[PDB]
Amino acid sequence: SSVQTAATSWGTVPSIRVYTANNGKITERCWDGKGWYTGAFNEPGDNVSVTSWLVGSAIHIRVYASTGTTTTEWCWDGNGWTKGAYTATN
Amino acid sequence: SSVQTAATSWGTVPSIRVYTANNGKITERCWDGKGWYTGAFNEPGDNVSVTSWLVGSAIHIRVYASTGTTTTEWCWDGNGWTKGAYTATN
Amino acid sequence: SSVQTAATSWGTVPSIRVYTANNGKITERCWDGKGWYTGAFNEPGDNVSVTSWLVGSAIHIRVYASTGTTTTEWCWDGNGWTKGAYTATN
Numbered sequence: 001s002s003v004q005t006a007a008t009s010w011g012t013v014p015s016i017r018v019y020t021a022n023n024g025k026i027t028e029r030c031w032d033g034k035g036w037y038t039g040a041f042n043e044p045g046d047n048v049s050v051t052s053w054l055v056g057s058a059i060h061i062r063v064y065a066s067t068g069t070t071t072t073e074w075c076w077d078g079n080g081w082t083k084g085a086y087t088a089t090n
Numbered sequence: 091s092s093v094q095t096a097a098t099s100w101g102t103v104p105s106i107r108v109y110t111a112n113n114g115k116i117t118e119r120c121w122d123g124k125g126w127y128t129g130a131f132n133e134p135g136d137n138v139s140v141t142s143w144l145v146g147s148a149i150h151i152r153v154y155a156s157t158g159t160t161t162t163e164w165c166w167d168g169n170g171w172t173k174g175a176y177t178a179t180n
Numbered sequence: 181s182s183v184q185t186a187a188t189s190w191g192t193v194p195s196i197r198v199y200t201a202n203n204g205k206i207t208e209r210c211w212d213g214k215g216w217y218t219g220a221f222n223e224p225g226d227n228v229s230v231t232s233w234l235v236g237s238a239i240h241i242r243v244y245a246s247t248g249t250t251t252t253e254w255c256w257d258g259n260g261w262t263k264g265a266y267t268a269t270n
């Protein structure tokens with residue numbers, strides 16, 4: 001078995017984010033044009049997906065983290081990661 | 091083992107779609123700015139990926155669903171889900 | 181167990197790429213509006229993710245391929261696939 005990743009990118013630079021689900025934990029590596037660095041995102045999960053969009057130069061990222069049948073959305077909206085409205089019945 | 095997701099988003103709102111492969115079936119949860127709701131997409135699959143693009147304000151989504159070595163593209167083009175041209179030799 | 185895919189798309193056509201991790205190897209199927217065809221990308225991996233961005237009409241793709249705890253970035257920047265700066269500590 002391998003680790004599992006999800007990626008997103010924005011802008012002209014570009015900025016890239018790469019999330020890795022590994023042993024029940026999802027972590028983050030970031031590029032803003034000046035070296036890979038380890039980002040603030042650190043939440044539980046066995047599976048991960050991501051999407052992102054820009055509002056002007058401001059980035060909004062949504063990360064879907066899954067453990068068993070439960071998916072939790074994590075929201076970056078410019079200040080920190082907050083838990084999003086997302087619900088499902090899996 | 092965990093459920094597996096894939097996500098895409100578009101526009102200023104934004105609209106988001108989140109596909110979940112769970113027990114051989116792929117289902118869909120949608121956001122258009124006014125609550126998560128369960129979308130029309132419901133097709134077989136153990137793995138899922140997605141990409142999407144806008145033609146004006148019209149959304150085109152492509153969902154790649156895999157069972158065993160077979161991938162099937164599903165196409166949203168404004169009216170309903172149709173099976174796309176995609177073929178592979180896995 | 182199923183094969184595992186990752187998808188990205190760009191432009192008005194659109195062009196689409198679909199990467200499939202199957203039995204330790206990641207391969208690529210491409211659409212540029214005129215039939216699916218098998219692309220140049222062929223590197224080892226059990227898991228795959230992708231993101232892409234346009235600089236004018238030029239496409240930059242980044243493919244994250246994972247085996248065990250090691251992720252390798254592969255870079256398309258208009259000429260061929262090169263191994264990218266990405267590092268992580270998984």
Ligand SMILES: C[C@@H]1O[C@@H](O[C@H]2[C@H](O[C@H]3[C@H](O)[C@@H](O)[C@H](O)O[C@@H]3CO)O[C@H](CO)[C@H](O)[C@@H]2O)[C@@H](O)[C@H](O)[C@@H]1O
Nearest residue numbers: 015017028030032038039040041059061076078079081
């Ligand atoms: C998107 C966000 O990125 C990291 O957050 C750090 C933040 O990054 C800035 C970055 O310096 C800037 O060039 C980029 O274009 O936008 C980000 C802000 O949206 O910088 C702050 C301090 O200024 C902290 O270091 C943040 O942690 C990452 O850590 C977050 O998890 C998330 O991916």
Ligand SMILES: C[C@@H]1O[C@@H](O[C@H]2[C@H](O[C@H]3[C@H](O)[C@@H](O)[C@H](O)O[C@@H]3CO)O[C@H](CO)[C@H](O)[C@@H]2O)[C@@H](O)[C@H](O)[C@@H]1O
Nearest residue numbers: 055060062073075077083084085086103104106121126
């Ligand atoms: C896209 C959507 O985002 C959340 O929905 C909440 C919505 O999010 C605002 C957020 O407060 C703001 O920081 C950002 O600039 O824009 C978001 C909208 O794109 O805010 C509303 C009304 O205040 C509610 O709080 C929504 O729950 C997230 O919860 C959704 O699941 C979805 O990802």
Ligand SMILES: C[C@@H]1O[C@@H](O[C@H]2[C@H](O[C@H]3[C@H](O)[C@@H](O)[C@H](O)O[C@@H]3CO)O[C@H](CO)[C@H](O)[C@@H]2O)[C@@H](O)[C@H](O)[C@@H]1O
Nearest residue numbers: 105107118120122128129130131149151166168169171
């Ligand atoms: C993309 C498509 O979305 C759902 O389809 C439902 C459709 O959604 C509208 C939505 O109300 C609108 O705000 C959004 O911006 O575009 C969608 C149309 O492209 O609304 C119709 C009735 O008007 C039905 O409810 C559709 O089911 C989802 O169900 C589809 O699977 C797909 O994700």
Ligand SMILES: C[C@@H]1O[C@@H](O[C@H]2[C@H](O[C@H]3[C@H](O)[C@@H](O)[C@H](O)O[C@@H]3CO)O[C@H](CO)[C@H](O)[C@@H]2O)[C@@H](O)[C@H](O)[C@@H]1O
Nearest residue numbers: 145150152163165167173174175176193194196211216
């Ligand atoms: C992007 C491409 O989409 C399908 O290719 C078919 C192509 O799709 C049209 C579709 O009929 C139309 O509703 C939408 O507005 O635009 C699509 C092109 O982006 O149509 C052609 C010629 O009629 C063929 O029918 C193509 O098969 C899908 O089949 C491809 O695999 C790919 O996802």
Ligand SMILES: C[C@@H]1O[C@@H](O[C@H]2[C@H](O[C@H]3[C@H](O)[C@@H](O)[C@H](O)O[C@@H]3CO)O[C@H](CO)[C@H](O)[C@@H]2O)[C@@H](O)[C@H](O)[C@@H]1O
Nearest residue numbers: 195197208210212218219220221239241256258259261
């Ligand atoms: C993105 C790149 O695509 C394939 O590379 C082949 C390349 O494709 C062109 C394509 O014809 C053009 O319409 C598209 O818009 O841009 C691509 C160039 O960036 O064509 C060359 C010869 O001209 C070779 O056939 C390339 O292999 C794919 O093979 C690459 O792996 C990658 O996905």
Ligand SMILES: C[C@@H]1O[C@@H](O[C@H]2[C@H](O[C@H]3[C@H](O)[C@@H](O)[C@H](O)O[C@@H]3CO)O[C@H](CO)[C@H](O)[C@@H]2O)[C@@H](O)[C@H](O)[C@@H]1O
Nearest residue numbers: 013014016031036235240242253255257263264265266
């Ligand atoms: C986005 C970034 O791409 C690599 O970073 C290298 C950077 O890539 C250039 C590339 O040489 C060029 O062909 C393309 O047009 O633009 C890229 C930047 O977007 O080039 C710098 C300085 O020369 C370094 O060589 C960087 O390593 C990749 O290595 C990063 O991990 C990331 O994906």
Ligand SMILES: [Cl-]
Nearest residue numbers: 034035036265
């Ligand atoms: Cl670096």
Ligand SMILES: [Cl-]
Nearest residue numbers: 085124125126
């Ligand atoms: Cl809601």
Ligand SMILES: [Cl-]
Nearest residue numbers: 175214215216
């Ligand atoms: Cl074809």
